[PDB]
């Protein structure tokens with residue numbers, strides 16, 4: 088596949104959809120999902136959420152030029168705001184010249200929390216749970232035989248205590264669960280429910296919340312990009328000077344939360360529209376992202392920007408990225424399935440990897456524009 | 465208006481729509497925008513973003529039962545996830561019994577940052593800016609006379625310094641701008657650009673970034689709700705026990721970021737779909753929400769939950785809420801305009817107030833379900 092899509096931005100929507108079809112070998116039926124409005128049947132919309140009275144459209148676009156670990160990919164995006172898809176495409180174009188985006192990711196591990204109140208000896212109870220870890224993990228893994236058969240399941244437990252609470256001490260067990268190609272919520276919630284009685288028995292507390300964490304910091308995805316000064320030269324500024332301007336803008340984000348919130352918002356302009364295009368939950372991705380940004384005690388930048396020893400601009404993005412290829416709208420929305428076809432992803436973690444590449448590209452594009460805009464006279 | 469809509473959840477989409485239309489006195493042609501696919505035509509979609517190949521639908525729903533400062537409202541919501549709209553509607557139902565949601569908000573004030581580098585005396589240069597603040601403010605306000613006539617404009621400046629970074633000394637001025645019924649990005653960015661040469665002249669420094677902040681902590685919206693124990697009683701649990709269980713859940717969110725992230729995610733399940741329904745930028749709302757939640761130095765809960773001196777459960781939500789009736793895609797998308805017509809909102813801050821009410825209801829619904837599951 089060649090994702091360069093020459094002249095794409097200036098073709099008609101019909102021509103763009105043709106050129107996509109050719110590259111991919113899309114079927115007639117697949118292309119027809121965009122012949123006309125109303126690809127989401129009302130019977131499916133009505134089954135998705137409650138109190139449905141119709142549907143609401145956003146534009147559906149494809150960013151060009153992306154390359155992930157040497158392989159070109161086409162990226163579908165759904166959003167209302169201008170400049171995003173262009174910026175993504177242009178920064179991907181520049182990235183290609185230097186090897187494109189390089190990505191990696193964790194296993195698809197999610198936390199399930201089990202909160203236990205009213206224990207007199209929570210610190211001791213924590214060790215009683217840890218002594219009985221294998222029993223808890225076995226129980227967690229009893230029911231979902233499809234998940235187990237696919238190579239997922241509860242791998243481990245950790246237990247945390249919060250001594251200092253206006254509502255008494257709490258103990259919080261986390262099941263660590265490999266959820267394969269799902270986002271994970273229903274999978275891990277179900278496990279948390281199943282193990283709760285046993286935990287109660289072991290600790291003598293009352294179980295309260297049994298619930299996933301959206302701070303999915305064992306489900307990380309990672310992207311790298313490199314840009315050379317020659318690529319960043321403008322009519323006004325040397326590429327070297329633009330690189331120094333981008334580093335200055337990164338440092339500003341890193342120290343000032345008022346800057347970091349906006350900087351990170353620009354990452355999410357890249358990521359969220361891919362989450363929407365694939366029928367995935369963008370509130371989960373948002374929460375994970377921003378809570379991770381402040382894990383240090385200070386709300387900072389999710390990306391990093393540096394200059395390497397050759398003077399090249401190098402950027403990273405590592406962050407939680409819980410997404411699915413299965414579940415809910417990702418399965419039932421015909422255009423979420425189309426999006427997955429367009430992407431070519433074979434695992435949820437491959438989707439996550441593309442997500443962070445396009446977040447990284449978006450932040451780069453935003454920073455580049457802000458760094459190179461002349462001052463008025 | 466009566467927002468109760470009994471058996472709404474069991475009507476067909478067509479019957480629900482016809483009921484809304486009759487309630488609101490929508491025109492045939494307005495109803496037709498939801499009764500048929502394709503209210504966003506391709507020539508509009510193609511002009512909205514780049515590299516367009518089609519459109520992508522989500523369901524468009526209406527939550528029932530909401531009441532805001534004593535006035536019933538209907539709330540459009542666009543999202544993919546089940547349980548949200550039902551929970552919003554059911555928690556609104558319970559709220560109504562005790563006066564509904566009570567809301568307030570600040571003026572629609574947004575920050576415009578202007579970053580200055582290249583000077584060895586940033587702390588001094590700050591005072592130079594402050595000494596000439598009226599000149600800066602007047603220059604900002606020359607750039608948008610209409611906004612000033614609409615009752616907005618640059619009100620003030622604040623200036624912050626970062627004398628020791630790994631990239632050298634920085635100074636950051638903030639324009640503080642009342643943006644009336646806009647989200648405010650383009651409005652404040654334009655002012656930031658306009659004042660940049662004057663700030664260079666004053667400081668001797670070089671202006672780098674000119675850009676809004678999404679941490680919109682001078683644009684707050686507030687909601688309150690009250691729930692009694694009789695309303696929360698289940699077959700398994702006394703309502704008093706449920707209230708204690710919700711207070712336990714809250715304290716857990718307040719101490720553990722792993723829990724707070726999820727707790728706040730539930731709030732945004734309620735808010736973001738209204739932001740989408742109104743053609744607003746949900747990334748901006750998300751960034752403001754989560755960055756605000758960690759302004760203390762610890763990422764905590766956006767809501768609060770307490771028991772008052774009658775034993776009632778009382779909840780709050782106060783947070784940044786930058787949204788528009790104008791600007792961006794609020795005006796471009798025909799269904800964004802219809803959503804605003806359904807809501808009846810006459811200012812952006814009124815929309816913000818509904819947003820926090822819905823977020824508060826959603827969090828309540830989530831916690832109630834988590835506290836009552838055997």
Ligand SMILES: C[C@@](O)(CCO)CC(=O)[O-]
Pocket residue numbers: 168349350351352353356453454675
């Ligand atoms: C341009 C930006 O504000 C996003 C606009 O939607 C991001 C940033 O400031 O880096």
Ligand SMILES: C[C@@](O)(CCO)CC(=O)[O-]
Pocket residue numbers: 298545726727728729730733827830831
């Ligand atoms: C139920 C919840 O996880 C949202 C599900 O989308 C929120 C919460 O845990 O409070």
Ligand SMILES: O=N[O-]
Pocket residue numbers: 191192193
């Ligand atoms: O290869 N790192 O996941």
